[PDB]
Design a protein around this ligand. Structure first.
Ligand SMILES: O=C(O)CC[C@@H](NCC(=O)[C@H](O)[C@H](O)[C@@H](O)CO)C(=O)O
Ligand SMILES: OC[C@H]1O[C@H](O)[C@H](O)[C@@H](O)[C@@H]1O
Ligand SMILES: [Cl-]
Length: 493
């Protein structure tokens, strides 16, 4: 039986395999193969209702939902001889995850007061205030992944390149800018993987990646957001196409503090000459959808009536003239070379010329671009992402003033949005589902009318597999919008 899987992704390299820092789809995908968490999404699901036992066998909460106790499975062992997974490892991981100096996702854990190892198999988490979902924070995504205290202490700066998890796969070696070689974790607590090896290959160029998949060089390849790729790959009977939840929302985040965009009329002019409905139609409706708000449509608290500015390029030119620009505006955007983001920026560039904007694009490799946008190097940021499907996540990270670039608490608030802080904070601890949803909708209307960010389309993850490969479960979703490979993944006879 075939046991070695070859996979091709839209990425140039590994940046970090430390789960408290892994942000790009590619790093998050590799991290989902290496690590586990206290709780997890069911394999093949990106649905929170599927949150179930992983390292924690079970858990208990008190009535005020501030104290959560987790009972750890005793049979879970670390990769690379680091022995049994203990409560001390969980305390270390969660204390690191909630630390802004040692984590990119500390903001998610702001409500945590303390994490205690009651005994070797028992973890107690105490919250200062209520969170919409504590289990969400402790799931196998972002800062929820558990790392060994002793392995991080020993490896330090090398840990991001030599990761240690308790997941079904381990990193044997990294071939910088070429591939990651993963081998089966033979001691994986749910059983020995059916696959012996994963060759995870960096194949950014779409035409080259498609050739490699077509020839059989790859068993799995990442697709794009275009219906032609979808049609061509379905036409060959040896392939199966997977359209994966969650959909990642793409927005033009405008830095509201920088001229000419510190004038609301200029931001409104830009919002009126982008055509999200045309983007969805051009790309294809199965994978792509125009979003009538500034957060993905699958979110608890989503506002379908957020008041998104309509397509009116005549109004754009009228607004620009009122703002002192009768001959238009030139904007230079630092643009990611991730092919989907590059194609999207190219379609935006053609569209915004209708309303008087000359959009110049400075192409930069994706991971380097991620660092530049976090140093305020672009006046506008074309960013595509999904978060845990509760409005608090997307709203805090992208639009709360504490998340703005330049602060030690910075997340992904590229727009320097500061209009919905009170509504975001109030919704976070609001008990009843309806008035919590109303505060979230209030936040969305304020973010939209201030034109902090212009929503475009949201896209489901697109991947192709050869018929011979079975995921070992039905693939509907995966939090990174990329396939999950587990101990159940196998090749058919
Ligand atoms: O989690 C995050 O913060 C980053 C999200 C991660 N997603 C990839 C991405 O932006 C999307 O695929 C994107 O919607 C484009 O391909 C749009 O066509 C990235 O930048 O690699
Ligand atoms: O734009 C085309 C080029 O970009 C791609 O992302 C690859 O890095 C390179 O192999 C290719 O020739
Ligand atoms: Cl990348």
């Amino acid at each position: 039986a075939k046991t070695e899987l070859s996979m091709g992704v839209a990425s140039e390299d590994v940046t970090t395999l430390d789960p408290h820092f892994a942000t790009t789809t590619s790093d998050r995908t590799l991290v989902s193969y290496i690590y586990g968490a206290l709780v997890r999404f069911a394999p093949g699901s990106a649905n929170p209702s599927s949150i179930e036992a992983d390292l924690a066998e079970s858990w208990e909460s008190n009535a005020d939902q501030l104290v959560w106790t987790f009972k750890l499975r005793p049979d879970v062992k670390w990769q690379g001889g680091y022995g049994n997974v203990t409560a001390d490892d969980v305390v270390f991981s969660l204390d690191k995850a909630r630390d802004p100096k040692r984590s990119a996702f500390s903001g998610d854990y702001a409500a945590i007061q303390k994490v205690e190892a009651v005994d070797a198999k028992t973890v107690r988490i105490t919250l200062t205030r209520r969170v919409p979902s504590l289990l969400a924070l402790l799931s196998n995504f972002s800062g929820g992944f558990i790392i060994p205290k002793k392995a991080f202490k020993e490896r330090g700066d090398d840990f991001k390149r030599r990761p240690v998890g308790f997941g079904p796969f381990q990193v044997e070696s990294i071939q910088p800018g070429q591939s990651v070689t993963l081998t089966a974790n033979a001691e994986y607590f749910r059983g020995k993987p059916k696959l012996s090896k994963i060759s995870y290959r960096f194949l950014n160029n779409e035409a080259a990646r498609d050739l490699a998949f077509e020839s059989g060089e790859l068993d799995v390849e990442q697709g794009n957001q275009d219906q032609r790729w979808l049609q061509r790959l379905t036409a060959n009977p040896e392939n199966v196409v997977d359209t994966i939840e969650p959909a990642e929302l793409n927005l033009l985040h405008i830095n509201i503090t920088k001229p000419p965009f510190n004038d609301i009329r200029v931001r409104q002019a830009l919002a009126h000459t982008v055509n999200a409905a045309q983007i969805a139609k051009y790309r294809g409706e199965r994978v792509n959808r125009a979003v009538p708000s500034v957060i993905p449509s699958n979110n608890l608290g989503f506002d379908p009536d957020a008041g998104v500015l309509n397509y009116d390029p005549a109004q754009s030119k009228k607004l620009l003239a009122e703002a002192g620009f009768p001959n238009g505006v030139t904007v230079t955007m630092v643009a990611s070379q991730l092919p989907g983001l590059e194609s999207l920026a190219q379609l935006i560039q053609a569209q915004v010329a209708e309303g008087g904007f000359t959009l110049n694009l400075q192409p930069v490799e994706h991971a380097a671009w991620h660092q530049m946008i976090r140093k305020d190097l672009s006046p506008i940021v074309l960013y595509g992402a999904a978060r845990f499907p509760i409005a608090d996540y997307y709203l805090t990270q992208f639009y709360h003033s504490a998340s703005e670039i330049g602060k030690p608490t910075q997340v992904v608030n590229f727009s320097h949005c500061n209009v919905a802080d009170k509504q975001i904070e109030a919704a976070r601890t609001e008990t009843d589902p309806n008035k919590q949803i109303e505060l979230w909708k209030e936040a969305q209307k304020l973010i939209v009318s201030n034109v902090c960010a212009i929503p475009l389309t949201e896209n489901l993850g697109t991947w192709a597999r050869k018929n011979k490969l079975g995921w070992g479960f039905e693939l509907k979703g995966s939090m990174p919008s990329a396939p999950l490979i587990t101990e159940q993944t196998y090749f058919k006879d």
